[PDB]
Amino acid sequence: VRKVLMICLGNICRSPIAEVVMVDTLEKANVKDVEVDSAAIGGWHVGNRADPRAISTLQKHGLKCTHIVRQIRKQDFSEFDYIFGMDEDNMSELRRLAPKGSKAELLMLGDFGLEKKNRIIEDPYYERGAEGFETAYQQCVVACAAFMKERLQK
């Protein structure tokens, strides 16, 4: 099995969408030997569910989110083949957390598929509405497909 882990700062807005979109993306491609999970850098929301705006955004697109927030752990860097951050702050945090020489490949999700200017998946939490969740969703749809096609399907 190949294992993919989506990471964002709190695991209530961005990475649960990326996790759900990746699973949906694998399903449409009939790729069955890839497991997907998500987790948080920080611990504020551990035990909670995704942001209501993330849940509603996925529903809008016929997807469901039943994920429970957990925090990343060091053994993640030995269990997962691919660990994805959403933005450059994510990448810095993952770099400092990864045990040197651990097997996980650290990638930023938007380096796949998107144009350069659209590669950062921005934290939507502090906006009023859910527009920032929809754009994260659109980005994940493009990025996840491209990653799957290049790296997972060769």
* Alpha-carbon gap, residue 13 to 146, rounded angstroms: 21
- The method recorded for this entry reads X-ray
Residues 6+ apart with CB under 8 A from 92: none
Please indicate whether residue 123 is annotated as part of the active site. yes
The residue from 13, 53, 123, 144 that is catalytic is 123
CB 146 within 8 A of CB 134: no
Please indicate whether residue 33 is annotated as part of the active site. no
Written as six digits, the tokens of 10 are 């709190």
* Alpha-carbon gap, residue 151 to 154, rounded angstroms: 5
Cβ neighbours around 36 below 10 Å, total? 22
Give the relative orientation of helices 52-60 and 131-147 as an angle to the nearest 10 degrees: 60
Please, what is the Cα angle at 19 between 17 and 22, to 5 degrees?
105
Residues 6+ apart with CB under 8 A from 118: 110, 139
The residue from 13, 14, 53, 87 that is catalytic is 14
CB 3 within 8 A of CB 79: yes
Written as six digits, the tokens of 1 are 């099995």
Residues 6+ apart with CB under 8 A from 148: 22, 25, 26, 29, 31, 34
Return the amino acid letter for 70. R
The residue from 8, 13, 65, 144 that is catalytic is 8
Please indicate whether residue 8 is annotated as part of the active site. yes
